[PDB]
Paper text:
In pacidamycin 3, biosynthesis the 3′‐deoxy moiety is mediated by [name], an enzyme found to catalyze the key dehydration of uridine‐5′‐aldehyde 1 to form 3′‐deoxy‐3′,4′‐didehydrouridine‐5′‐aldehyde 2. In stark contrast to most characterised dehydratases, [name] is small (121 aa), monomeric, co‐factor independent and utilises a non‐activated nucleoside, rather than a free monosaccharide, as a substrate. [name] is the only monomeric, metal‐free cupin dehydratase characterised to date. We demonstrate here that the reaction most likely proceeds via an E1Cb mechanism, with H42 acting as an active site base, however, unlike many other dehydratases, no metal or cofactor is required for activity.
Solution of the structure required the preparation of the seleno‐methionine derivative (SeMet‐[name]) and demonstrated that the enzyme was indeed a cupin.
Author numbering: 2 to 121
């Protein structure tokens, strides 16, 4: 059994202004990924099946959850139910849990967000 996954062996890419680290573990109950963000996630989306739970390792930002501003800082936990519109601005390092496991078929695009809208 493979228990340990490393950053060296992960898939690392930029998506809508964030840097994602996808470790490549397979577990139907949850997908855990790393997110690094310099200014924002410049796209609003929702997921019809999975909750999105962000742990803020470091930094400061603001989530927009169904257009409601939710400030976030280091050590905060942001828990987003399924079918909730999400975007965010900030300079932050985060651990993101998607539960149950992320499936691209469950994701929906709402709108792009102008890069000038981030105060970071």
């Amino acid at each position: 059994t493979k228990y340990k996954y490393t950053v060296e062996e992960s898939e690392r890419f930029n998506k809508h202004g964030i840097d994602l680290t996808v470790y490549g573990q397979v577990d139907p109950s949850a997908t855990v990924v790393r997110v690094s963000v310099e200014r924002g996630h410049f796209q609003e989306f929702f997921n019809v099946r999975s909750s999105y739970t962000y742990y803020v390792v470091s930094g400061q930002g603001v989530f927009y959850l169904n257009s409601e501003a939710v400030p976030a800082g280091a050590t905060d936990l942001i828990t987003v139910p399924p079918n909730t519109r999400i975007h965010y601005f900030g300079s932050m390092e985060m651990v993101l849990t998607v539960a149950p496991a992320f499936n691209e078929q469950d994701e929906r695009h709402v709108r792009f967000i102008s890069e000038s809208e981030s105060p970071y």
